[PDB]
């Protein structure tokens, strides 16, 4: 019997423009009188949470609640409590989460990897990697654009941020894009806009054209 | 009260060149008369397993045994048993493990990407990445060799094999090697070998130089 | 009256990926109650050996047994005993074999040679040789592939590892691939895989193309 | 107890300019009254044989006799007898050899394989191989010359004639050479002269030049 809380990443902040937190409950049967609350540091009011998840066939229930909060309030380290009181456990249990402060702010350096010459001799495809290296927070958001309009999530997979090996502590990730060849010839600069909390304007983009390795 | 068996992954198979299986026992007290055995399909004897773990402070014990098993015997799907009989549970319990046959064996296709020129301008670090993409088993081992001599794992970070969603089902990985600017200039061709169980001879190597993307 | 024990050659280890030792008996009549056993250093049990050879017309018998042996256990120099007891000789005779350790390991250096211009004028064949020179063990194994799919042994010939006299002691071999002329022109990069015990990952590939020796 | 006779190959014929057949005796003690005789088809006289070998420490003796014979008489399939009559074996045993006629005569086609460009960039060596392929007899005398003068056999090894795989039946061989780069620049055309009995003038030479692959 455990209760799991997922804090909002910077990646989930940027695409939705509104931060929120969840709290899933495991190994608790599908009963009623589910107690879900979210409190501030002073225990103030909370936006209502709806859309309770379905009942799992293995006699377990996971209630999902979403609650809004300010951007600056999440970065200040304010503690939230996930108080749960079910029929099996009348004693309330509180799951405490906060911002893990204590990590430096290093701006990401982004070097996007072009198509190579020996690739573009089969005349079949182009594949691109957007290496987002050297940033000290562990939360980056990477998405791709084409001519200024954002690209579908079907075309890219952003890695999870791993620590850089040769540096003692600093994180890195990257994303991949797989595209065509004739489309590469005319247009499609393929901007990889990467957002990080340590950038001054919170947005950085890199892109290529044909005349990059010329 | 449960007993966990760890199957040998292909990373551990290729790293040690000797497949071995373990059996870790959870939620059982640090008592004597610990019964750990490994039987074949016909129940034949096994190599003696030593180096049992210490006693955990939370009244639990994990008796870990490492046994040598033939490579062709393990890959033939021969069933192994982990019989456990403690003082708390006099009834013997068998945990069966085997090779998970029936999965597609798609070879890794390895492309070794040279570092971006925008990185080769600060004259501080140079990240060489080995895009190991498109293979159906999830157990890939990637490592790098310098001048034919294998490199220490401190210098390269190998990703987790995450599925390529463009495929119906197939995983991919990547492994970056970050080196100094001056070191990549003269010497160190920095090959990236890729170990997978689907390759015809189980090893694929690719090479890079200063004079490749030129 | 003698008993012959055949150690597995490294070409046999790589071709089957399962090392196995045989023990054939010479100049002993085709009688019953043939004693064939394989014991470890501690004399442990062995896999059952089947497929006994047929009775020779010249009144001699050779019971050949095949046993699966782990690679690390075989490569550690563990002694194996071939105990034989026939009706003619009631006294047991033991043929002891093991790994001949202590031999210096020198990896093969493999260069692939594209066919001569004067050969590319008759347009009847194109003999491509994989010069495998300079390696201290005498057990080399060379195979060729065709776009990843390995090629049958009917199309290439590998010489025996014969001594390179310029070295103090180091043998060398050579493997040629004869193909069709129009087949060599369009496609078929023709990787030559060289297997040796002294390589790091035991496999070395070299690839060729028309646009290499120009 | 056996007697071994070694038939003279064409390389030994072309080298010493006088064919001779040997007859070594195995498993016979170092006694006197050694009977060694060479008879023609009609049993004519033979050249006297001297230089008997020393006595081996393992209680065995091998009397080696050398006797000259005509080129045409040897090539016409005239049978020679090696009669041995020792103290241990009073019964005279005859060892008969003859020229194995019945194989077609195909001349070799020599394609000496030149150095490669990347091979001649280390500026430390140069290696030359002399691929003699497609000759039907199995007796080929390959040697190297430098500016018309023959090169010492310490710098080359002629392979053994192995059957070609793509051909039904036809032999091939080649021989290696390693030289310096600075020497190659001015001189050393390296005519690899091959002597084969099915050629009309019985000698072909192929060479390399600086302007071979330009």
Curated annotation (Swiss-Prot), chains A, B, C, D:
<comment type="subunit">
    <text>The basic structural unit of both sIgM and mIgM molecules consists of two identical heavy chains and two identical light chains; disulfide-linked. N-terminal variable regions of the heavy and light chains form the antigen binding sites, whereas the C-terminal constant regions of the heavy chains interact with immune receptors to mediate effector functions.</text>
</comment>
<comment type="function">
    <text>Constant region of immunoglobulin heavy chains. Immunoglobulins, also known as antibodies, are membrane-bound or secreted glycoproteins produced by B lymphocytes. In the recognition phase of humoral immunity, the membrane-bound immunoglobulins serve as receptors which, upon binding of a specific antigen, trigger the clonal expansion and differentiation of B lymphocytes into immunoglobulins-secreting plasma cells. Secreted immunoglobulins mediate the effector phase of humoral immunity, which results in the elimination of bound antigens.</text>
</comment>
<feature type="domain" description="Ig-like 3">
    <location>
        <begin position="8"/>
        <end position="98"/>
    </location>
</feature>
<protein>
    <recommendedName>
        <fullName>Immunoglobulin heavy constant mu</fullName>
    </recommendedName>
</protein>
<feature type="disulfide bond">
    <location>
        <begin position="130"/>
        <end position="192"/>
    </location>
</feature>
<feature type="glycosylation site" description="N-linked (GlcNAc...) asparagine">
    <location>
        <position position="51"/>
    </location>
</feature>
<feature type="domain" description="Ig-like 4">
    <location>
        <begin position="108"/>
        <end position="209"/>
    </location>
</feature>
<feature type="region of interest" description="CH3">
    <location>
        <begin position="1"/>
        <end position="102"/>
    </location>
</feature>
<feature type="region of interest" description="CH4">
    <location>
        <begin position="103"/>
        <end position="211"/>
    </location>
</feature>
<feature type="disulfide bond">
    <location>
        <begin position="23"/>
        <end position="82"/>
    </location>
</feature>
<feature type="glycosylation site" description="N-linked (GlcNAc...) asparagine">
    <location>
        <position position="58"/>
    </location>
</feature>
